[PDB]
Amino acid sequence: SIVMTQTPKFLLVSAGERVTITCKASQSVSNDVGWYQQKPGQPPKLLIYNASNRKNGVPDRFTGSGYGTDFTFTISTVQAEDLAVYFCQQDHSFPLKFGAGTKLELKRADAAPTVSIFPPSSEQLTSGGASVVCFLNNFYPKDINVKWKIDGSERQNGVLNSWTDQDSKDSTYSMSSTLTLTKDEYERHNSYTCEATHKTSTSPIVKSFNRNEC
Amino acid sequence: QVQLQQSGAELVKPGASVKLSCTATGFNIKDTYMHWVKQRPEQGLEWIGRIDPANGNTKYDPKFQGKATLTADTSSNTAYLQLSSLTSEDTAVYYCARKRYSMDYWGQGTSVTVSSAKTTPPSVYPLAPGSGAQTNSMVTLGCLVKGYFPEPVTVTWNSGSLSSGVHTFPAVLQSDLYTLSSSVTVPSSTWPSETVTCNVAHPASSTKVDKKIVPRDC
């Protein structure tokens, strides 16, 4: 039961800086410490063999050091392809324990979202439901708010939001907001509005459509 | 030459049993220790146990004593993880790894979902822009995949032709059904002049749906 405590959980860093991930073994572990990298949707990949020995085909910017209780994983110059979750591991005592993980996030300049609004599909209207979908693409920082307005009235029920993981190409986030209503309620009203309030602008980014038009 | 081939995804009712296969290549299984790791969604990695294929020695984390039984067959170079008494807490991706002389190689992972909810094929709805939508250099098209269970579904655009401007959003669970959306941004000179089709696959229900993005007709 040698437990590995890994800090930080979230590492907000800028490209070109240096990230240091620390894993503290509750008891002595010495040589038997490994560091893993897990890109989203991929199996974890080993980066450090025995707390300082890079496996092979590993960028020399990935370094590890420490002995006993204190162990450190350091990225010399953070890069876009380094976006992943990093785990420490102890194989000294057979109750093998991983760290909680460190999610690395790249810092970049504020980017305004590109907002698109889509009326419910014709096929779904036959089903008896109506989903209005709003896309907020290529924005930073991640925190953003979406307000749904129907004929000028704010709607807070039936809204599902989903954020993408940070895109390594441009270090941005994308979010999708879906307002789901009954077909009768959708056909009752005409104006449906998607509003995006972000750190880029005090004013909200607004996209709308009218149902009595098609 | 060293790869670990894992079995396909499994959906099981609570209380059932599952067996996962990890077929190896490029290294005999008895000269290394095979390990199995559990990862719950949006969570960390949990070491289940290790199997010594030469003699059958098994060591488990005390939380996986009865739930997980590790068996190995050196003849097929295949390691097995059997999961019984399955509950919702066992819903996770299960990996198999080979460890020898502080060396590691991992398989692709196998997803096991434990739920009483029935398998539900998705409904795929094309999302064309509004009839009076703004015209610009680029046009964004959408695709809605609603009311399916279990995860995962795969979304492609024009069978992989369109890939640069695709944002597929993580699914959201609601009333035991998942819903996700996918967006593709293409130059306005290429739509509707060229075809844009949403390709959705839901392996658990053996569903493959292609939905072309047709401009809205009034």
Author numbering:
A (entry chain L): 1 to 214
B (entry chain H): 1 to 52, 52A, 53 to 82, 82A, 82B, 82C, 83 to 99, 101 to 215
The article reads:
pmcα1-Antitrypsin is the most abundant circulating protease inhibitor in humans.
This was partially ameliorated by using antibody-derived Fab domains. The crystal structures of 9C5Fab alone and in complex with RCL-cleaved α1-antitrypsin (referred to here as AAT:9C5Fab) were solved; the latter localized the epitope to helices D and E of α1-antitrypsin.
